[PDB]
Amino acid sequence: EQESVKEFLAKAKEEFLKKWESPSQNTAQLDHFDRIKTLGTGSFGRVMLVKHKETGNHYAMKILDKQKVVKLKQIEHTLNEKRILQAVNFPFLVKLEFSFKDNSNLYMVMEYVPGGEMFSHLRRIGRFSEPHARFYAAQIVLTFEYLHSLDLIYRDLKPENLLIDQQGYIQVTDFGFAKRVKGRTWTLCGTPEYLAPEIILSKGYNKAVDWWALGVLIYEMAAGYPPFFADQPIQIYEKIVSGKVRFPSHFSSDLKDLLRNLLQVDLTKRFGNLKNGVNDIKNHKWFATTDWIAIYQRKVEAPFIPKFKGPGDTSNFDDYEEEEIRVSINEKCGKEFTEF
Ligand SMILES: Clc1ccc(-c2c[nH]c([C@@H]3COCCN3)n2)s1
Numbered sequence: 281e282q283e284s285v286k287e288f289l290a291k292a293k294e295e296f297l298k299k300w301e302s303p304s305q306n307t308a309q310l311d312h313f314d315r316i317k318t319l320g321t322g323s324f325g326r327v328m329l330v331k332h333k334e335t336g337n338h339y340a341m342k343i344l345d346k347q348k349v350v351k352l353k354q355i356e357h358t359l360n361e362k363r364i365l366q367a368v369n370f371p372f373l374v375k376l377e378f379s380f381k382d383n384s385n386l387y388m389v390m391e392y393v394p395g396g397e398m399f400s401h402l403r404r405i406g407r408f409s410e411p412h413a414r415f416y417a418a419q420i421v422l423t424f425e426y427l428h429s430l431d432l433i434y435r436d437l438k439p440e441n442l443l444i445d446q447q448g449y450i451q452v453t454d455f456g457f458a459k460r461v462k463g464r465t466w467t468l469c470g471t472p473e474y475l476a477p478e479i480i481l482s483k484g485y486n487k488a489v490d491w492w493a494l495g496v497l498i499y500e501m502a503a504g505y506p507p508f509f510a511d512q513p514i515q516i517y518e519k520i521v522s523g524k525v526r527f528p529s530h531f532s533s534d535l536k537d538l539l540r541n542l543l544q545v546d547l548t549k550r551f552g553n554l555k556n557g558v559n560d561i562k563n564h565k566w567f568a569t570t571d572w573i574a575i576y577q578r579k580v581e582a583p584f585i586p587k588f589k590g591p592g593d594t595s596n597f598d599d600y601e602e603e604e605i606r607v608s609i610n611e612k613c614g615k616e617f618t619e620f
């Protein structure tokens with residue numbers, strides 16, 4: 281690669297390691313914020329729009345219930361999420377601004393990205409044109425080049441985890457499955473449609489699973505539906521491990537070629553995992569019109585700017601029942617979360 285790229289990644293790794301070895305902790309508390317709206321909710325956590333009472337700034341606060349994290353066997357994953365988020369820095373990664381814990385919950389206070397999930401915009405428009413898909417895909421390629429160089433595997437690429445910012449660029453959220461891995465790792469995690477075959481087959485797997493998931497994402501952005509779709513996970517998994525993929529006739533020949541190499545069942549033949557690494561992807565004909573430096577510098581005009589009224593607008597997110605943020609008078613699971 282160009283020495284300028286090698287030196288950039290060397291500095292990125294130095295800066296990551298300094299924060300990784302000495303993580304920040306306990307940098308705000310709950311009563312510094314007003315709660316505004318629930319933006320999403322799941323089996324152990326939720327994300328809420330909040331406003332900082334002294335500065336007036338808006339943030340997305342991810343709240344995890346310690347007891348539910350323990351019950352669902354997510355302790356190590358939640359510790360990974362916060363330790364990685366406080367150590368990374370890249371244009372297309374959502375920034376963690378504060379973190380803290382109390383008797384009941386863990387809190388990660390992130391920048392608020394008001395344009396909403398890519399998923400909403402994709403389903404609204406139906407499918408993205410190839411140039412539009414390629415603009416987003418280029419940002420993911422650069423983000424994975426960065427993360428992988430730090431020995432991080434992301435493991436949760438899907439349209440719901442990619443938010444669109446005020447300039448139309450991506451911000452990757454949700455580091456709940458991200459992990460620092462030199463070599464292989466073994467956990468079954470991720471969403472069914474996006475799982476690589478070696479995850480489904482319970483193998484020791486590596487960063488190649490992120491490049492498989494990029495193939496699924498590009499397919500879904502350009503078609504409007506994912507390549508291995510079926511009604512139940514076991515049926516999805518059978519399709520994935522066969523790897524038989526059908527492409528819409530409107531796909532360009534270059535797009536089909538790139539996707540056959542990303543959706544390669546044999547991980548030892550998959551683009552992103554060969555001797556030339558990410559450069560087999562960046563140099564592929566489907567990306568011939570991409571100016572990688574201009575994307576990194578955010579100098580390319582985006583295909584689409586989300587419609588919103590200001591930094592507190594929640595119109596691009598949906599409506600959930602509003603539940604209390606209860607804090608027990610007694611400390612729960614203190615040992616398990618000591619390092620958070
Ligand atoms: Cl992943 C990435 C790999 C290499 C990257 C890179 C190389 N050079 C730059 C920028 C361009 O000008 C502003 C600062 N340096 N990024 S990103």
Ligand SMILES: Clc1ccc(-c2c[nH]c([C@@H]3COCCN3)n2)s1
Pocket residue numbers: 320322326327340342374390391392393394440441443453454455
């Ligand atoms: Cl604005 C936002 C900033 C950060 C957000 C965030 C972090 N983690 C999640 C996930 C998405 O997938 C499943 C569970 N909650 N959103 S949204």
